[PDB]
Design a protein around this ligand. Structure first.
Ligand SMILES: Nc1ncnc2c1ncn2[C@@H]1O[C@H](COP(=O)(O)OP(=O)(O)OP(=O)(O)O)[C@@H](O)[C@H]1O
Ligand SMILES: Nc1ncnc2c1ncn2[C@@H]1O[C@H](COP(=O)(O)OP(=O)(O)OP(=O)(O)O)[C@@H](O)[C@H]1O
Ligand SMILES: [Mg+2]
Ligand SMILES: [Mg+2]
Lengths: 50, 223, 413, 411
């Protein structure tokens, strides 16, 4: 229960649609209400999974 | 070693490799000749087990300027054993050597690996005839660019005169001032004047009747 | 009484006939298409490299100066100024998207060049003016100033000896002889519409005067006037009719003004509302208060019936040049234009060809000239014969204009 | 100069399909077992060679210190901006999505030679500085319409249309393969082609066979594809459509079902009708309007032709009108022959039984007959197909078209 309470006390994530990927772990995402962005990936996700 | 390969051309017996390679058992710069008489006896067939040892031994290794000639000459012998299974491996040859070398290569690709297209066919078709100016209009001048301008030269190693004048004259226009005329002003017009050699007499392509060789190979392969 | 399936009878089918090579040929095709995939993700060589210079020149900048241009450098914004007050700054400044502040000048400014309506560099924290700016120029009229010559000479607009004569009077002659209009006491018209059948030569007369203009010429893309936002298209009209007043005697060519407004109605309470606001803004900067002076407007359409009578009034569009079909002397001149630069027999006549194209346009005549050479490549020739053109007339016109009158013709001979 | 900008520095990306379209035994023979295993040999070796390529790389320098600090010089959340004007003192002005405009500098390694007001750039968050410039900027609605795969077989697939096959080859394939004939007469090849006729005749096949055997790239447009609701979103996608085709290869564009894109351009009372009618009026402008076209060919296809706008039918825009009529008693044999290629055919049948007796039916009818007769063999527990399958199949397919037209007035 204490492990359940600490993980919920954490800022939420953003949802954004990937247009298409760049090279070397970079993509091209407009979120909803903003410009587009070139960001970095995490460990568990890959370029070929996009 | 080339006259050795011409004196033992065209037999897949693999005794000639046992003859030649055990005869010049030597240092590796003389074992440059290992790949010559190996595959000069291997003009054309399906012997894909040779084509993998034509890759897997000296594939890349990154090779800091020691046996870079041998991986070019190992790729030189990939050029034949491809020009007569009658187009079955020619599509596979242009698929591999377009992606693997000129894409993820180094000295093997960006210096020498275009002489396949100067050895595979001399007929001309816009697949490979347009894939070479993808790496020629991009001259990539940082190297000793007459490597890429050698690939300019026998890009016009396709006979049977064509509409390819659009490529050569327009590259000759950028080739007068830039791509300096001290070195290759002979070359671009050597490429220009060779397609219209005569009107006729363009059969230099080692295929008679339907598919037999008629060598032929002994006179071209020195160049 | 027809049923022929039961799970035991399924096993009859896939063992009868080539049990040797059925799966033996199939999974070879299956795993190679799997191998088409597994090469592609193993390559992964997409490489969208952009932005970077050649890496042999920026080495001096990105040693310390780039780190020196992070923290001391400023992320200041540009704004606009309403006014000022005496003895103090008391500067009133808007953004038009953010709020409106009342701020102070900084130390690095001269307090004279803080005139009203000026773009100024504004701090992010205390919002002080730092750097004044040159004024904004409109970005899309620069995109449509042509700065380029399309190569059509007046010798290619044959069959129109009088329509060019009307069009020469309005455009070319006051720009080169602005004397005889005043020295007799007349004024030239300032708006010319072009209307008629399609493919008749509307674009040619506009393309040929862009050659011989010696003046400012502005092509206007018609559907840039229609936008997504409300009132945005009307603002695009204004910036066009301001910079024309700055320089002297600039030409503005609209094209297909059928699209940007043809009729003003409201019965279903709605519809093309935003299109009307842009279209009526075009009218009030065409006539009204502040007449424009030396701005000449050319328009061209294919459907002139469906246009607004507010544009049909002279004073906005003054000369109605129409294009018709060339009778015979026009067409015989057109064949000599479009077939002089092609390998033909040097003895053929063209007046026989101009007979057989009774109701035809300049586009249809050129299509006959291109098609006749295509018959020469159907055979193996390098020059055109008389029967090459005669088959081309039947291919272009007679294959689509008539099918009952040619076989069952015997009412007319 | 003479060769200003050397024409946009841009290559072309054609298709990667058609690896080996030579499976020509077309039956369960050992050749096709031998041929496909050869294809298995080369692709496995292409896999293993590039597997050795990412394996035996002992080269590490990782930027030689130059790009590595640069990749740390730029921010990790790289953002996207838009130029408004260029103040060239290494301190320019940009615009964000909301319109917040910032007097940003140029943090370096960007040549000031390919940045124009309208070209989108790359920015920071902490200082908003220009780091790179965004390239290719395609809205992801036109990249969906870019074909990568050759779908079906070549011209030998369709069952005999050779008078009109030679027509479309004169305007698409032959000017691209051999443009030496045209300079001898100075005649430009035709641009626009209409495919029209009754439905079920071969319009969609003739585009797919061209898209199979080609060298330039290919674009497909399904009818009401360029239609949106934001009153300017319609005509804006058409500009980007021809922009992508012009920037890439000397390629062709196939826009199908253009009967929903043109009808005679009349003026009426509906307000949503006009943003329909306006988008379809500037396609006219991009096609054969102002100065130039480039090497872009357009192929269009409908069922009905008389309900079109006459502004599109005129030459200059479309130079070929091609009828596809219903077949004859001769080339119909080729339709039945091809669609009965790889099916076990009993020797009792005569192909000319159903051809000569009935003289009305499309090519798409014949494919339905061949599939239905094959279902009748499994319906009565058979592999081979006899005449009695085709007797029941020729009935069951054709009972979807009404009884007749008038009684024996004429004689
Ligand atoms: N009078 C003419 N003389 C010579 N050529 C002509 C003439 N009229 C038309 N043409 C030829 O027809 C082609 C098409 O004409 P154009 O498109 O300019 O007609 P248009 O009236 O502008 O068409 P639209 O009304 O659809 O804009 C031109 O390229 C031109 O070569
Ligand atoms: N001449 C032909 N030879 C072989 N097959 C044909 C022929 N004509 C039609 N077909 C068959 O018709 C199908 C293709 O349909 P088709 O190309 O006629 O559609 P379409 O003309 O676009 O129809 P619609 O106009 O109704 O959309 C294919 O499956 C093919 O088997
Ligand atoms: Mg026009
Ligand atoms: Mg269709």
């Amino acid at each position: 229960l204490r492990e359940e309470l600490q993980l919920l006390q954490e800022q939420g994530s953003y949802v954004g649609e990937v247009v298409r990927a760049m090279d070397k772990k970079k993509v091209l995402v407009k979120v909803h209400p903003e410009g587009k962005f070139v960001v970095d990936v995490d460990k568990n996700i890959d370029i070929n999974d996009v | 070693p080339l006259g050795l390969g011409l004196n033992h051309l065209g037999k897949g017996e693999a005794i000639e490799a046992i003859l030649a390679a055990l005869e010049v058992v030597s240092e590796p710069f003389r074992s440059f000749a290992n790949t010559l008489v190996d595959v000069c006896a291997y003009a054309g067939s399906g012997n894909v087990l040779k084509v993998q040892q034509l890759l897997h031994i000296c594939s890349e290794h990154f090779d800091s300027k020691e046996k870079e000639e041998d991986k070019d000459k190992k790729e030189k012998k990939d050029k034949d054993k491809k020009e007569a299974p009658a187009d079955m491996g020619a599509h596979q040859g242009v698929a591999v050597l377009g992606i693997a070398l000129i894409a993820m290569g180094e000295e093997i690709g960006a210096e020498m690996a275009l002489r396949t297209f100067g050895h595979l066919l001399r007929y001309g078709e816009p697949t490979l005839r347009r894939a070479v100016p993808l790496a020629l209009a991009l001259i990539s001048v940082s190297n000793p660019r007459l490597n890429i301008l050698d690939t300019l030269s026998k890009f016009s190693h396709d006979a049977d005169p064509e509409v390819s004048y659009n490529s050569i004259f327009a590259m000759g226009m950028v080739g007068s001032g830039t791509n300096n005329a001290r070195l290759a002003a002979m070359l671009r017009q050597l490429a220009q004047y060779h397609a219209k050699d005569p009107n006729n007499l363009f059969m230099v392509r080692l295929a008679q009747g339907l598919t037999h060789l008629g060598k032929g190979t002994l006179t071209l392969c020195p160049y | 009484p027809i049923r022929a399936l039961d799970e035991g009878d399924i096993a009859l089918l896939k063992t009868y006939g080539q049990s040797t090579y059925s799966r033996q040929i199939k999974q070879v095709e299956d795993d190679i298409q799997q191998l088409l995939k597994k090469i592609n993700e193993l390559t992964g060589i997409k490489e969208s490299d952009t932005g970077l210079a050649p890496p042999a020149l920026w080495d001096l900048a990105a040693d310390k100066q780039t780190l020196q241009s992070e923290q001391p450098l400023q992320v200041a914004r540009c704004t606009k100024i309403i006014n000022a007050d005496s003895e103090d700054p008391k500067y009133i400044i808007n953004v038009k998207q953010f709020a409106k502040f009342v701020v102070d000048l900084s130390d690095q400014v001269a307090p004279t060049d803080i005139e009203e309506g000026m773009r100024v560099g504004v701090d992010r924290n205390k919002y002080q003016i730092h750097i004044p700016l040159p004024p904004k120029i409109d970005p899309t009229v620069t995109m449509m100033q042509v700065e380029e010559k399309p190569d059509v000479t007046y010798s290619d607009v044959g069959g129109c000896k009088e329509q060019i004569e009307k069009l020469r009077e309005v455009v070319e002659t006051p720009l080169l002889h602005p004397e005889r209009f005043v020295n007799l006491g007349i004024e030239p018209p300032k708006g010319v519409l072009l209307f008629g059948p399609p493919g008749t030569g509307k674009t040619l007369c506009a393309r040929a005067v862009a050659n011989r203009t010696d003046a400012c010429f502005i092509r206007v893309i018609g559907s840039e006037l229609v936008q997504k936002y409300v009132g945005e298209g009307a603002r695009m009209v204004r910036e066009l009719f301001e910079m024309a007043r700055t320089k002297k005697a600039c030409l503005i060519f609209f094209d297909e003004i059928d699209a940007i407004g043809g009729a003003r109605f409201d019965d279903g309470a709605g519809g093309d509302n935003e299109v009307q606001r842009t279209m009526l803004e075009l009218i009030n900067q065409l006539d009204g208060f502040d007449p424009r002076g030396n701005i000449k407007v050319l328009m061209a359409t294919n459907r002139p019936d469906t246009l607004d009578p507010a544009l049909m009034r002279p004073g906005r569009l003054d000369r109605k040049i129409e294009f018709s079909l060339p009778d015979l002397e026009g067409r015989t001149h057109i064949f000599k234009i479009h077939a002089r630069s092609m390998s033909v027999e040097r003895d053929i006549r063209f007046e026989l060809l101009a007979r057989l194209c009774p109701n035809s346009t300049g586009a249809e005549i050129r299509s006959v000239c291109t098609e006749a050479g295509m018959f020469a490549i159907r055979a193996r020739r390098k020059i055109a014969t008389e029967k090459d053109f005669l088959e081309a007339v039947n291919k272009v016109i007679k294959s689509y204009a008539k099918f009952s009158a040619t076989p069952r013709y015997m009412t007319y001979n | 100069p003479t060769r200003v900008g050397k024409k946009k520095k841009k290559t072309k990306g054609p298709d990667a399909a058609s690896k080996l379209p030579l499976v020509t035994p077309h039956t369960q023979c050992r050749l096709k077992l031998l041929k496909l295993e050869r294809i298995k040999d080369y692709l496995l070796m292409e896999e293993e060679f590039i597997r050795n390529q990412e394996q035996m790389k002992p080269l590490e320098e990782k930027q030689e210190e130059e790009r590595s600090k640069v990749d740390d010089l730029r921010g990790t959340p790289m953002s996207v901006g838009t130029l408004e004007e260029i103040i060239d003192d290494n301190h320019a002005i940009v615009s964000t999505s909301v319109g917040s405009e910032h007097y940003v500098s140029i943090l370096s390694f960007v040549d000031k030679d390919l940045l124009e007001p309208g070209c989108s750039v790359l920015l920071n968050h902490k200082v908003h500085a220009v780091i790179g410039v965004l390239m290719d900027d395609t809205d992801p609605l036109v990249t969906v319409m870019k074909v990568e795969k050759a779908p079906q077989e070549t011209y030998a697939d369709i069952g005999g249309l050779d008078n009109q096959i030679q027509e479309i080859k004169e305007s698409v394939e032959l000017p691209l393969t051999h443009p030496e004939y045209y300079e001898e007469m100075g005649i430009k090849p035709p641009k626009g082609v209409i495919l029209y006729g009754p439905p079920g005749t071969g319009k969609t096949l003739l585009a797919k066979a061209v898209a199979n055997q080609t060298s330039a790239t290919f674009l497909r447009v399904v009818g009401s594809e360029l239609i949106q609701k934001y009153l300017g979103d319609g005509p804006k996608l058409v500009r980007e459509l021809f922009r992508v085709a012009e920037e890439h290869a000397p390629s062709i564009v196939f826009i199908d079902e253009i009967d929903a894109i043109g009808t005679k351009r009349y003026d009426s009372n509906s307000g949503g009708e006009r943003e329909i009618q306006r988008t379809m009026l500037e396609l006219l402008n991009q096609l054969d309007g102002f100065d130039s076209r480039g090497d872009v060919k357009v192929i269009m296809a409908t069922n009905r032709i008389e309900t079109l706008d006459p502004a599109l039918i005129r030459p200059g825009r479309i130079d070929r009108k091609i009828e596809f009529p219903l077949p004859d008693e001769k080339t119909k044999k080729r339709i039945f022959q091809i669609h009965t290629s790889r099916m076990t055919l009993a020797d009792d049948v005569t192909l000319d039984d159903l051809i000569m007796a009935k003289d009305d039916l499309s090519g798409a009818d014949i494919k339905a007959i061949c599939t239905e007769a094959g279902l009748m063999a499994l319906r009565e527990r058979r592999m081979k197909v006899t005449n009695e399958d085709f007797k029941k199949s020729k009935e069951n397919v054709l009972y979807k078209k009404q009884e007749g037209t008038p009684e024996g007035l004429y004689l």
